[PDB]
Structure formats: C-alpha cells, structure tokens
Amino acid sequence: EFEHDLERLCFIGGYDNDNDKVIVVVTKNLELFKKYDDINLIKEAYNHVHKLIQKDERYTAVFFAHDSTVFSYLGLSLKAYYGMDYYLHKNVKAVYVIHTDWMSKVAIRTLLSIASPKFTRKFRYLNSISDLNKYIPLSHLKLPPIVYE
Amino acid sequence: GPEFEHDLERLCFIGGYDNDNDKVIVVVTKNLELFKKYDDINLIKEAYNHVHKLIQKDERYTAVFFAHDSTVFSYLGLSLKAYYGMDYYLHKNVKAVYVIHTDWMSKVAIRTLLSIASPKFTRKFRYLNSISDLNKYIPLSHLKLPPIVYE
C-alpha cells in the first residue's frame, strides 16, 4: 500500500564479508510521498528502519544522492539520520554518500574534514617564513617576492 | 582566459621538493585579489580543478600556506575553508600543512572548536563520486541495488 513505497527507499541491500548488514537509502525516492496527505512520514520512517536493524547489531549506511542537494532529500534524509537514537550512530561501521551535486559534495567533504582529526593535526602554525626553514629547507622552493616583504 | 590560468598558477603552484623528492606545493593567500578583476566565473571550482592538475591521485606531498599580511582579511581562513572541502585523498596524502600567520589563533579558533564538538558519528562518513568507487570497501556482488544506478 503506502508501505509499498518505503521498501523502495530503504533496503538491506546485502551483507558485508564480516556478515553484518548494509542499509541502502535512496534520497531521491521521497516524492513518492507528496501524494498521500495526513502522513507524518518521519515517525513512520523511524518505525520502518527500527524493524530493519536489531539494537545491538552493527550495520553500514549507504546513501544515494543522485540529483539531490543539501536543501532537499539529502539535507532532510541526514537531519533525520541525526535525530535517531544514539545506538544507531554507535553501531555503524561507516556511512557512504554517493553521487550528489557539486555544492553538496564540497559541503559534505568540509564537515568530515572538520570531524576527521587525523587530518587536522598535520597542520603546524608558524609566525613567519623564517621558522619554516627548520622543516622544509628554503634552499629548494622558488617563491614570489611577496613572501619576503 | 589565459590570463586567468596564469593568475591561478600565481596563486597555487609547485614550490619545490624534499625527501623522498615529494612535491611541496605553495599557496599564497594574498593572491586572491588577482581574481577580483574578473566577472562571472566559479573560482573555487577551477581552483579545485587546478589543484587536481598539480598533484595526482596518490602522491605524498607537503602544503604551505603563506598568510603573513594583514588588513581587512588575510583569506587564510578562506583558502583553508576551500582546502577543507577538497577530495578526501588530498587530505590523506599530506605530509604536513605549514601555515605562515602570526596571530593565527584569531582565525582558526572557530574551526578548532567545531572539530572539538564534532561527534564520532560524522567521522565514519565518506563521500564517493559514483557507484563504482564503492567496490573497495563493500563488495557490490553481495548487494541488490535499485534501478536508479543502472541503465
């Protein structure tokens, strides 16, 4: 019925080689639901996905952007995904976003870069170019004169 | 046109090498004024394109940001925000990111705190450009996939 449109938005597409679930979600198949009226759609989604993952069960999330932006179908899909209970966030092994537009791609990779700490450490802040010579020698390095003014 | 691609090379270029003779690329932060002279163009896009040309898919390298000036913006925060939104590989293959600014804490304070408050949940994420790039982590033979990704 109505329910015969959710299992065109959230499957267990398969299982990893560690024999734990993968959960596929297509961010584009919500316009199926602008035609019903009266449905809350997010509690019903929460109910749906709850029946797909046991509570102490590790899984994997895969989203299909595919002509959705952060202002529609992906912004709403994830923001939903953040309001879930904590165990869903603790049990994921990884979450994969696939094939969105440029704005969403640069916006996504930005927040992971903030999140991923192993990357934010290779930074080292120097007061002037004089101090860089310790790490990268200035005997290499052709530079414009502006870095010496 | 050509003056554009030349300004791009003046903004971000190859500085030199180290050991094991890996590229050390240099980005000058005072040098985004060269693009004010232009009208309609998506700078950040072609800047990503230019950096893609400068270093290939897997190549260890060091990055250096020159932000020692002052005034109404030094655009270190602007070039960093641009750097943070670049392809994941460009984040892994970095040896180090040296950043030449004196009062740098007055700039990276907001970012530092955003990293502090980022939950481990958002850390396990990863974007992939197309469906083919999944294969390494999860095998697709194991999965039934919708007609959207097919012909």
Residues of chain B neighbouring A17 (CB-CB closer than 8 A):
139, 142
What's the resolution in A?
Answer: 2.8
Q: How far is the alpha carbon of A114 from chain B, nearest alpha carbon, in Å?
A: 5
Residues of chain A neighbouring B120 (CB-CB closer than 8 A):
89
Which of B121, B133, B135, B136 should we substitute to test contact with A (largest number of A Cβ atoms within 10 Å)?
A: B121
One-letter amino acid for residue B108 of the chain: V
Residues of chain A neighbouring B131 (CB-CB closer than 8 A):
98-99
Q: Do A109 and B124 touch (CB under 8 A)?
A: no
Tokens describing residue B70: 């002052």
Place of tokens 């270190």: B76
Dihedral (CA of B37, B38, B44, B47) sign: negative
Q: Do A112 and B94 touch (CB under 8 A)?
A: no
Residues of chain B neighbouring A107 (CB-CB closer than 8 A):
85
Q: Nearest-CA neighbor of B34 among B67, B13, B10? A: B10
Tokens describing residue A3: 């329910």
Instruction: Determine contact, residues A145/B29, Cβ cutoff 8 Å.
Output: no
Place of tokens 């240099």: B26
Tokens describing residue B150: 């097919």
Determined by X-ray
Instruction: Determine contact, residues A84/A118, Cβ cutoff 8 Å.
Output: no
Question: For the purposes of burial, counting CB atoms within 10 Å of the CB of B131, is it exposed (0-12), middle (13-18) or buried (19 or more)?
Answer: middle
Q: Do B24 and A136 touch (CB under 8 A)?
A: yes
* Chain A: residue whose CA lies nearest to B91: A119
Which of A60, A109, A147 lies at the smallest CB-CB distance from B138?
Answer: A60
Which of B127, B145, B149 should we substitute to test contact with A (largest number of A Cβ atoms within 10 Å)?
A: B127
At the top level of CATH, which class does the domain B1-149 belong to?
alpha beta
**A55/A21 Cα distance (integer angstroms):** 12
Q: Nearest-CA neighbor of B68 among A24, A132, A51? A: A132
For A2-148, CATH number out of 3.40.50.1010, 3.40.309.10, 3.40.50.2000, 3.40.525.10 equals 3.40.525.10
* CA-to-CA dists, residue B133 to A19, A50, B53, B122, B136, angstroms: 21, 28, 20, 20, 7
For A141, left (φ over 0), alpha (ψ -120 to 50), or beta? left
What burial letters (b/e) apply to B33-70, b meaning 16+ CB within 10 Å? ebeeeeeeeeeeeebbeebeebbeeeeebbbbbbbbbe
**A65/A74 Cα distance (integer angstroms):** 7
Residues of chain B neighbouring A108 (CB-CB closer than 8 A):
125, 127
* CA-to-CA dists, residue A144 to A17, B25, B30, B93, angstroms: 53, 13, 11, 26
Q: How far is the alpha carbon of B1 from chain A, nearest alpha carbon, in Å?
A: 22
